């Protein structure tokens, strides 16, 4: 059994490298004009992978778009042991109840352009500085964006999934499209992609990709984000539970 | 005992996840194929030749991708077992003389190229329908080819010769005659590509024969993995590079491939 499983695995690893090579090489052709003139802000959870975010950022650029910022959500933010703390330092009511919704509404007004009063640079910088000072976020490097991708890791062991799904759902009405993307395993509870797909309201509001660890998933983030911005069309993609198909049907 | 069971579980988990990633890449490739080949063969016509070991699904995927690229397929011509066995050169010569003993593949490639391809040069004579039909019927009557459709096959700009995968060592005659056939078609149109299934990059298969010969490798493009979606799409992209850029390339995952697809 061990011999057959290792020979099968070794041959599959070789075959997958050729498949990944093809998809990386033709990626720019697949995403051509998908995000022309559009800006995207990326949010990442603590379990998100650098390589997944770098591949998504690169494909946004190949699609004619631009990334305004990468904002990291800290362990303190996702662990929801500070809803009262968040409101005490900065809340969405100061700009022109659960932690996820409140932070999504606040960061959405601050970083996304409503499809509403324009948020000036100083108000945005004050909001970002307050959240960083209190341990909620870190960020690189900030202008306003049209759309957003919230990137997570894969499976969660054990309400971190809920707070991130509610965070993404609260960002959605503040811009032209929100996509929640996770790695393989994110389509299983209690991860955020699974929470989103199991709730009729959230699944009709934001798109999801469950396999951002693979090249088809990284490309699909851009294609599905294009469908959100241009067509107002939501979709759930990948290889896990609740995925309607590996990628956009059109 | 527990370590052996843990090894089996971990190996099963790795193999299962790789199978899922590979099936997803094939499905992803099918869904985005039209985007990749968008406008690649606009206003161009392609004639397909197939050997007995070629697969219907590989040819249907190529024909479909040609159409998604804005092109059209004029005809599918089957080369028979008598053709690939390349032991009827004298008999073929007696047919070529009613349309030096030249090798069967080369003679047939030159004749079918004149009949089915439009020469890249405007001053070359146009082959009228009756001359084309007479040539096709003489080769069908003597057991060299069959073709679809039977009536009104038009002229094409480019060609794809489709084969199966690996050949046995004793089938060297079949690899050689098909590589020579494809090489002889090349000067008669705007581009010829020889595409085979996984294993075709190993000798004595036609793709392998082409890649190991300096002259043929410089004259026609090759794809060695037409059984996979990357290979089917690459046929159209590499055909585009031949017709529009005069650039030859050797693609796929086997010996002599410069890369999986065009750059």
Author numbering:
A (entry chain A): 47 to 142, 152 to 170, 174 to 199, 203 to 219, 223 to 314
B (entry chain C): 41 to 139, 150 to 313
Give excerpts from the publication.
Although Mtb SteB was previously proposed to act as a mycobacterial outer membrane copper transporter, the crystal structures of the homodimeric protein, alone and in complex with the RipA coiled-coil (CC) domain, rule out this hypothesis. Instead, the high-affinity SteB-RipA interaction, together with computational and biophysical data, strongly supports the role of SteB as a direct RipA activator that releases enzyme autoinhibition upon complex formation.
D,L-endopeptidase RipA is the major PG hydrolase required for daughter cell separation in Mycobacterium tuberculosis ( Mtb ), as RipA defects severely hinder cell division and increase antibiotic vulnerability. Despite extensive studies, the mechanisms governing Mtb RipA regulation remain controversial and poorly understood. Here, we report an integrative structural and functional analysis of the SteAB system, a regulatory complex that has been shown to modulate cell separation in the model organism Corynebacterium glutamicum ( Cglu ) and is conserved across Mycobacteriales .
